[PDB]
Amino acid sequence: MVEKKTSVRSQDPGQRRVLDRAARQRRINRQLEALENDNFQNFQALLEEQNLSVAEGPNYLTACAGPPSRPQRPFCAVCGFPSPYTCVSCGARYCTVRCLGTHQETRCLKWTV
């Protein structure tokens, strides 16, 4: 009988760990910076030199729109449909168990380094 070789990359649940607030905020900031960027999946130094001589007044700082009044809507991260759920590990949202599984397999805590 053919012996089906199994994978050895499985991780122990005793070693798997939940995430925190600072790392989630850094995730969000990185995702937004990537969405703003345009290259393979600099202006950082540009904005650094910019803020080097910025103050409070009629400028970019006091010109930014800011947060809106209508509350943030909970959209999904995998399929994009309305997501009433959240990921207890990282806080990501989802709408179905299939979406949760795809997130755990492809997104959950794998890009944070």
């Binding site: 009433p84 759920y85 959240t86 179905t96 168990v97």
Partner: protein, 411 residues
Amino acid sequence: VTRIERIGAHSHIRGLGLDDALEPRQASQGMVGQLAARRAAGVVLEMIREGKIAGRAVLIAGQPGTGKTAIAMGMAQALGPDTPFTAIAGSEIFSLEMSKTEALTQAFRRSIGVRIKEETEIIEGEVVEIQIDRKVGKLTLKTTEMETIYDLGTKMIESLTKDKVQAGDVITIDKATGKISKLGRSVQCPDGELQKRKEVVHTVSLHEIDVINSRTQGFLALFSGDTGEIKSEVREQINAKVAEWREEGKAEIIPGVLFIDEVHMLDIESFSFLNRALESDMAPVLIMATNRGITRIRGTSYQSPHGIPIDLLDRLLIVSTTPYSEKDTKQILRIRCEEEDVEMSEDAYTVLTRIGLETSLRYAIQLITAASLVCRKRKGTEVQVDDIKRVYSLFLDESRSTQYMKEYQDA
């Protein structure tokens, strides 16, 4: 082991034993013989399922105890659930908190159902952790396939803090209202999605609607606090609003059935009220039974058939039942024995049929269990003719006790 509902005089009746063309079988679904009345009842049951015609009354008459109430229980069991079948005795309308006419119209309205459908998103999962910051808080719900966090409002976090804040409780969250209901210490945990959109269908009767919309804390339909509902605003407006729900995709009416047993107890007032209650578009279909022949109507000295006035008897159809023969009586007794845990011999069945045809049918049906318990005393297994005779001697009947009155008692 033993439930509330136990073996009764009509427990064997599982419904009408009719075919696809409303043709009664010799003995099916616990109903024996009575072919004419059974096929006449199937027709009214079919047009009840139809519901396009309103205000029909079908009376059943014949000799006392000729399956008169059995046919009604069979009709009820065939109509099944999701279709109100209100059975009431002719005395139940005589009340002190409500007039007889008010009780009769109350029963008429209870015999009419209103179907309504809606969607609602419901949650069901095991609580994992809770936090409250004196106010807003957070919750963690779990199911066998997934978990999630929720930022709860003040009311929700308060309702959750009302219980044991630590894990263990498997709760349900009706997002519409948010009423919490902990099923137990995680009863097992649920499978599938945590939050699912469920369809909710309700068959609420017009009487329930009236009681709900008649008063603050209106739901007095649990103790009959509906004393004289105000027809001026309550019932007329409810009828109008039900007609508006109709033909708009909101609701649809489901006409029920009203079984008035022993209607000869009703009075001329109740009959005069029925004369017009059976003419309204919201009037349900009803059946009625009677044991008396041409007798006096309660209220005056008028001698009328069935104790029902002529102006109302002309407003209904009548179905006569034939007396049971040896075959029908024996088959009914056999069905009763099969419903019960008793088993009789062939000679025992013959003797019991003879005894139930000499005096009356109910007598044998009652002696069945007595003979079973008497044969169980001598340490036997089957009810024998000697046991049936022992019982026939111990317990008397109507005709043999009315003749033993050769010694004068009080009067």
